[PDB]
């Protein structure tokens, strides 16, 4: 690539994220004062695990739909054979959703935006997997402390998805090329915005794999019996 072709890649990835970000950052920030009351929190905790599951499943499925639309607008993604488009999304979609969640999290009171208001992890008590929920909250708290910009999220999440080492890739070389060009873009933008410092602060890549694998294993247990 040439430097202006890289800048062009950046701009495009950043626009794709803006068009598929699902909740706009301005509206999340403005809602931080809109917090569940103790009686509303009690209402969630009284819900059966089954109802909580169904709600969580619906919001996850919505989120994944936006991630998929994002993938589709990354240049070169749609020219990949359908097998590899599926491999990459199967592996990385939930990982991207976990990263996107940091935008909806308030590290000042450890609350997340859920169904219209902010609430703590105790909102989710009826699922009975506090270990998992607290590690999700802990991961988002780790990310929020970086003060991730919109564009940083865009570029980082595209590299979450465009990863040549996922197994079953039928055109591993095409994916490498796209990953390479997105890495150049990412590192270039960090230089133009003076944010080189965040690279060494990003989650160990295995961190997201390992958290997503656990998260899916809970989802697995809920959406087998009773889809």
Swiss-Prot record:
Q: What is the effect of changing residue 63 to F?
A: Completely abolishes transcriptional activity
Q: What does this protein do?
A: Nuclear receptor that binds DNA as a monomer to ROR response elements (RORE) containing a single core motif half-site 5'-AGGTCA-3' preceded by a short A-T-rich sequence. Key regulator of cellular differentiation, immunity, peripheral circadian rhythm as well as lipid, steroid, xenobiotics and glucose metabolism. Considered to have intrinsic transcriptional activity, have some natural ligands like oxysterols that act as agonists (25-hydroxycholesterol) or inverse agonists (7-oxygenated sterols), enhancing or repressing the transcriptional activity, respectively.
Query: Which tissues is this protein detected in according to the database?
Result: Isoform 1 is widely expressed in many tissues, including liver and adipose, and highly expressed in skeletal muscle. Isoform 2 is primarily expressed in immature thymocytes.
Oligomeric form and interacting partners: Interacts (via AF-2 motif) with the coactivator NCOA2 (via LXXLL motif). Interacts with the corepressor NCOR1. Interacts with CRY1. Interacts (via AF-2 motif) with the coactivators NCOA1 and PPARGC1A (via LXXLL motif). Interacts (via AF-2 motif) with PROX1. Interacts with FOXP3. Interacts with NR0B2.
Q: Regarding domains, what does the record say? A: The AF-2 (activation function-2) motif is required for recruiting coregulators containing LXXLL motifs such as NCOA1 and NCOA2.
This protein is called Nuclear receptor ROR-gamma
Please report what switches on or represses expression of this protein: Up-regulated in the state of obesity.
Q: Where is the NR LBD domain?
A: 5-227
Species source reads Homo sapiens (Human)
Which disease annotation does the entry carry?
Answer: Immunodeficiency 42: An autosomal recessive primary immunodeficiency characterized by increased susceptibility to concomitant candidiasis and mycobacteriosis. Candidiasis is characterized by persistent and/or recurrent infections of the skin, nails and mucous membranes caused by organisms of the genus Candida. Mycobacteriosis is characterized by infections caused by moderately virulent mycobacterial species, such as Bacillus Calmette-Guerin (BCG) vaccine, environmental non-tuberculous mycobacteria, and by the more virulent Mycobacterium tuberculosis.
- Please give the family membership noted in the entry: Belongs to the nuclear hormone receptor family. NR1 subfamily.
User: What does the record give as the organism's lineage?
Assistant: Eukaryota, Metazoa, Chordata, Craniata, Vertebrata
Q: Where does it reside?
A: Nucleus
Shown portion of the complete protein runs from 265 to 491 of 518
């Amino acid at each position: 690539a040439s430097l202006t072709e890289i800048e062009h890649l950046v701009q495009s990835v950043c626009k794709s994220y803006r068009e598929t970000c699902q909740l706009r950052l301005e509206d999340l920030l403005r809602q931080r004062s809109n917090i569940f009351s103790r009686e509303e929190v009690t209402g969630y905790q009284r819900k059966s695990m089954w109802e909580m599951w169904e709600r969580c499943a619906h919001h996850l499925t919505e989120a994944i739909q936006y991630v998929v639309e994002f993938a589709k607008r990354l240049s070169g993604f749609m020219e990949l054979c359908q097998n590899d488009q599926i491999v990459l999304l199967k592996a990385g979609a939930m990982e991207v959703v976990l990263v996107r969640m940091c935008r909806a999290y308030n590290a000042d009171n450890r609350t997340v935006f859920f169904e219209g208001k902010y609430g703590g992890m105790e909102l989710f008590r009826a699922l009975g997997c506090s270990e998992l929920i607290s590690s999700i909250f802990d991961f988002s708290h780790s990310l929020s402390a970086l003060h991730f910009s919109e564009d940083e999220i865009a570029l980082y999440t595209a590299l979450v998805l465009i990863n040549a080492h996922r197994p079953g890739l039928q055109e591993k070389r095409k994916v490498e090329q796209l990953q390479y060009n997105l890495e150049l873009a990412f590192h270039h933008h960090l230089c133009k915005t003076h944010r080189q410092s965040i690279l060494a602060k990003l989650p160990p890549k295995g961190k997201l794999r390992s958290l997503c694998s656990q998260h899916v294993e809970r989802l697995q247990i809920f959406q087998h019996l009773h889809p």
